[PDB]
Amino acid sequence: SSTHIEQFMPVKLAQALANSLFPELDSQLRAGRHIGIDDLDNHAFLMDFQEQLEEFYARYNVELIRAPEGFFYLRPRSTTLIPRSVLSELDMMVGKILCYLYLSPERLANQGIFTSQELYEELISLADEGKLMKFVNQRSSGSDLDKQKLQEKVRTTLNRLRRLGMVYFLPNNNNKFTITEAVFRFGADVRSGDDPREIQLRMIRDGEAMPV
Amino acid sequence: FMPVKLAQALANSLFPELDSQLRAGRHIGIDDLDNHAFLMDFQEQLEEFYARYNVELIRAPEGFFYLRPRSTTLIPRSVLSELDMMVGKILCYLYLSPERLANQGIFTSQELYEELISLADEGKLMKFVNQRSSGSDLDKQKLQEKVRTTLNRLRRLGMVYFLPNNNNKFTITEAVFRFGADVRSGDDPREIQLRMIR
Amino acid sequence: SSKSVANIIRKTIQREQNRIRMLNQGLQAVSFGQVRGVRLNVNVRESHAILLDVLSEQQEQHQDLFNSQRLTFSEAMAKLYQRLNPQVDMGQRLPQTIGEELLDYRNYLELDVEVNRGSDGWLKAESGALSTGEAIGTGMSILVMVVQSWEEESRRLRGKDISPCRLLFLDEAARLDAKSIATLFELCERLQMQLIIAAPENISPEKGTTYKLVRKVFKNHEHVHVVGLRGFG
Amino acid sequence: WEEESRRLRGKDISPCRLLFLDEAARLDAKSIATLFELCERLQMQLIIAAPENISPEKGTTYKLVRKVFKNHEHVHVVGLRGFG
Amino acid sequence: LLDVLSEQQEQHQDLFNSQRLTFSEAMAKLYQRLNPQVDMGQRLPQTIG
Amino acid sequence: IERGKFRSLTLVNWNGFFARTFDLDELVTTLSGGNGAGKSTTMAAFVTALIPDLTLLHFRNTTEAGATSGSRDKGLHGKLRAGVCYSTLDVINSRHQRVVVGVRLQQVAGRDRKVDIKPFMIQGLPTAIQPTQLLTENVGERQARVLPLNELKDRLDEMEGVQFKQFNSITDYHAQMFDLGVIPKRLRSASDRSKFYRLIEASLYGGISSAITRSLRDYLLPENSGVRKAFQDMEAALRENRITLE
Amino acid sequence: IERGKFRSLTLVNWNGFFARTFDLDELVTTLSGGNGAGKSTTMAAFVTALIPDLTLLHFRNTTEAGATSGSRDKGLHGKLRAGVCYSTLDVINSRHQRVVVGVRLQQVAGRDRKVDIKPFMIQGLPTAIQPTQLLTENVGERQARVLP
Amino acid sequence: RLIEASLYGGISSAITRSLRDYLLPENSGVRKAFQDMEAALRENRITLE
Amino acid sequence: LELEYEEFSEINDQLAAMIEKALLVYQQEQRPLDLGAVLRDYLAQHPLPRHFDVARILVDQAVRLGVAEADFSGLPAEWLAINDYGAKVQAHVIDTY
Amino acid sequence: ITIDDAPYFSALYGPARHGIVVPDLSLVRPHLETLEDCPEDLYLIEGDP
Ligand SMILES: Nc1ncnc2c1ncn2[C@@H]1O[C@H](COP(=O)(O)OP(=O)(O)OP(=O)(O)O)[C@@H](O)[C@H]1O
Ligand SMILES: Nc1ncnc2c1ncn2[C@@H]1O[C@H](COP(=O)(O)OP(=O)(O)OP(=O)(O)O)[C@@H](O)[C@H]1O
Ligand SMILES: [Mg+2]
Ligand SMILES: [Mg+2]
């Protein structure tokens, strides 16, 4: 009959949009936040109405995507109605290091709590210290002043990744933090054992990752 | 459940684009025929929809629509620069009576540049560019660059419409009144606008 | 073409303004609390005023757009309107519809309601800026405006010796003070318009007919006893 | 609500009680009598408004008259009493 | 539902021969668990549990 | 000259009114009684007889005067009683022709609170016969019997010169009312009915109506065809050609 | 136990009131007068002094009651005059302590019709002091002035 | 809400709709016992998801 | 300045008292009451300006005494005149007490 | 004009129904020689338009 919700919208979609959790989650998702298993309220809500939300956001030319590790996020298309942005290369260095930390069983004893110092030590352990230093300051040659500048830039990027939902600070201590599974998107270029260049081309075609 | 008319409104094809523009802070004037009509038709429900975000949907007395966030806003907020409000109040002044005969609604960047330089005090101009500046050519060039930049910001707010060509000539919309002064019985708009600009 | 269309539009606008001005005079000096008068303010939008003037006097500058047979007249009107005020956007709607909108004279007019409150001048009538009684009185004023307009509209489709009936209501009339009720009675009497008002006995208007109601239980059923009085004064 | 806060409050304080009602003229005499007895039995204060004096034999009453005066407005207040 | 959750297997299996109470029903409320039809939002209402 | 007038309002078998007729004043009629006596009920009867459209009819309480639709109950069902109910108006035109217009109301049985409505009109009735007499039989019992439309049609057709018209659609009913000068505008379509009802109910509750204020030009200005039809005819040749090409 | 009571309400520099004090009753207090006299304004002043949360205060007309409107204007600003304004309550506690709560109200200059509120409280005031006099200064020949 | 409903008078739509929230008070003894079960039930939700 | 005062008049309450005392007899004897005759007799005792109020109050007192059984007959009552200058009343006779 | 007076007026004015009202009729006398493009029978009337 007329004046009936079904005329304009599926009942389940209207039911979802009327929920009290929707505004918070919509605002955060448009901001780029990733959703993991730990924030039960939001994750369960996403699971309950997944298809409705995907069909809804499709109106904006953006895909609501679910990674195999179980975390949701938004990927805009080329004709997106919502702006799109790319992370910095330093963000990538710290992200891949956070991933390697999450996998590492040798540090499983920490029970998930890591310190910025440990992260810095691992990063310098694997990357080329001095040549990576080139990005912090063009004149760096190992000086302690420039080392402190690198540490502070790392601290700042780690805070930004906290806003993206990639890491949670402890309730009372800001020098220690716990990882979330969302970090595994930093491994997208190696999770399949094949030629790196074809992987890269597939990612760029899928819109996952841009070059610089 | 959900009110039937609200579901109808947000089912409309025009909603996603208007939502994206509104959340960016754009103002909808009488110029945007379809968007303005849509808001006129579904205001009673859209106000409720956006109240769920702790954000207010206001229709100005002149006729244009816009969003005002509360302190508890669920949408991340951002704030304009001092030079931005200076230019906005200048544009409000230019929405004058002799304007009709002077320019037929179409201005140029130079009009605004020269008006800004003539009407403002030097000290706040230096504060805008940099305190170390003093009456130098490079400072004036930087101020011109900043004027173009803030004018583009205002164009994103919908205050000013650029004429479709590469040159910098534009027309002022009614929504510029948001920068304007308080009006009291019998007060002359020119005088009160100048009084605030001073 | 051109000028003649402008003239018919102008005459239609002028006639509407004059009729409104005549209706407007019947509402002068109506006392409702601190409100002392009501008006219907009629104005012409600028974006259409300039268009009307251009169509009147600069037609030689745009004749290419009017006599081009590849497009119709209403389309020509829409295209001229977009040529002026270029900042206007069009919502992917056919130019034909925008043309027919320009053909409808009502779209050229801007309408407001104003009240002459207290020591102040003419103010736009906002509900939140008035007391309760003032709001009720203003509502009645606008309603009689509508009724008069509708009767003038239809009389060209009615018999020469027919005059329709006019009647309006007011529930919870106790909200109005004696002075306001006197004003309302004066208005309706001057307008030959009937009234039915309900009040829980607080008001006793001397003129007209009065009905006393009392609800009772009789043989285990609800029953209303009714008595009537009239002719006083 | 008063019963809920019995625990938190100090033993010796009973909070104030007060309510409003605009356009009281919508109620008839019997209804107002009922309302008054209810509120007085509960030690409840009331503030009511009506164009005409609907409660002549209970409580206090004030009469307001607005005067236009030298291009501004002024309100004059006078009390009313049950008997004279 | 409180009776279902309160009374446990070993003692009340002799009580459970009634048609209204069984263990699996706690998981059956998983359906009700996902989303009840709450309308107005303040503080934090979430689910049957 | 000599504007028409409403003469009387009659209720039959409504809640609290078995058979009641009100003689309306030429200028002012005042209803008076304690709370819950039935004043608003009489005005409900008047307007429902005037505009018998169940899509528009909604008698919300005076408190909460401006809220949304809310409940599915329109507030009318409870004002009726079991059996058959009537509401009728008596009118005198400028021609001094006596015309009686009204509707027949009945509670539709079911879980929900729904109502059935049927308009009708009578012309040529003698001045000596009152509506209550037409609609009731004075059987031996203490209380009369309200007679359905079948009995009413048979009873009226027996009279000399009296015509009984029974309508199948609201549009016809409003057309006849306009032709006889009972309303100021002929309600072409449902939109016109909605605006007319807006006018009535805004007057009923009182205050500056929001809806009237929004669409002020739509209410106060008549629509003029002269400006248009010239250009529709001139445009015709192009329209046909375009359609043919498509 | 003796329950607390509201003794009086005071208004300063409101729309139509310069400095007026209503003495409340133990059971019922009635306000009468023709339309537009200022009754609803007195109600509004009381409630404002009770809950100064400006996000909540919304004074609709009595008509249009119950309609959630989101009106552009909350209706408080117009009830105030230029300059400083007050609204205060005198209360007798169950402990027989006299306490004066209130708020200072002031219009905000600018196109938006905004309002400023600053609550305050006074304890231990002598019983002989009236709020009307406490809030004003006698300047000139019986031509008092309000003080910030 | 309470004061405003009193001022305009009548059956306030918002009050009746959430009458539980307005009338029934909250109890801390219930919470103290339910804290343990709250931990348990959150754990169960984790596993289910 | 200091607050002044103003007082109410109890003339209408006194009027109600005389009317109710005068009317109580009808109930006690259960005598059929006709508003027309009673109003015509009772208005003669007051001057014209006060007639309207007297009529209102008398009707208020009279309706509390029983009902008129004729109301269920479907037959409307006539408009009876009760004084000169042209005042009218409509009511069935009160029979059921 | 109403439908009832329409036939009367149409009979009254006859062929001149579609003439033009012009209050002087001497101001047209100079213009008239130019009228080569007009209906074969043009009607003019004097009075207040
Ligand atoms: N839909 C309904 N269902 C049930 N009872 C109703 C309904 N409508 C009205 N009533 C009852 O009918 C009686 C008359 O109601 P009504 O609204 O006509 O009173 P009133 O005389 O207009 O009162 P007031 O002027 O105080 O509003 C009251 O008892 C009311 O409770
Ligand atoms: N926000 C406002 N802006 C301007 N004038 C206002 C405002 N609010 C009220 N007024 C005016 O102040 C005067 C007092 O209004 P108020 O509603 O207090 O009176 P009242 O005696 O309670 O009237 P009523 O009983 O009719 O509601 C009226 O003239 C009203 O128009
Ligand atoms: Mg009622
Ligand atoms: Mg008021």
Author numbering:
A (entry chain E): 2 to 213
B (entry chain F): 9 to 206
C (entry chain A): 1236 to 1468
D (entry chain B): 1385 to 1468
E (entry chain B): 1286 to 1334
F (entry chain A): 2 to 247
G (entry chain B): 2 to 149
H (entry chain B): 199 to 247
Would you copy out the relevant sentences from the publication that reported this structure?
MukBEF folds the chromosome of Escherichia coli and related bacteria. The heads are bridged by the kleisin MukF, whereby the C-terminal winged-helix domain (cWHD) of MukF binds the ‘‘cap’’ surface of one MukB, and the N-terminal middle domain (MD) binds the coiled-coil ‘‘neck’’ of the other MukB.
All three conditions enabled the reconstruction of a state with engaged heads, and we pooled the datasets to increase the signal and obtain higher resolution (STAR Methods). At the resolution limits of ~3.5 Å, the nucleotide density was indistinguishable between samples and was modeled as ATP (STAR Methods). The resolved state was free of DNA, and the neck gate had opened widely. ATP binding and head engagement had triggered the detachment of the MukF MD from the MukB neck, which resulted in a swing-out of the MD of about 180°. Detachment of the MD was facilitated by the mechanical distortion of the MukB neck constrained between engaged heads and aligned arms, while the MD swing-out was stabilized by the binding of MukE to the top surface of the heads. Our structure reveals that occupation of the top of the heads by MukE and DNA is mutually exclusive, suggesting that MukE senses the DNA-free state of the heads to open the neck gate. While gate opening is a prerequisite for loading, it is likely detrimental to loop extrusion and needs to be suppressed during the operation of the motor. Our findings suggest how this is achieved, and how the switch from ‘‘loading mode’’ to ‘‘loop extrusion mode’’ may be implemented: once DNA is inserted into the clamp during extrusion, the top surface of the heads becomes inaccessible to MukE, blocking the gate opening mechanism described above.
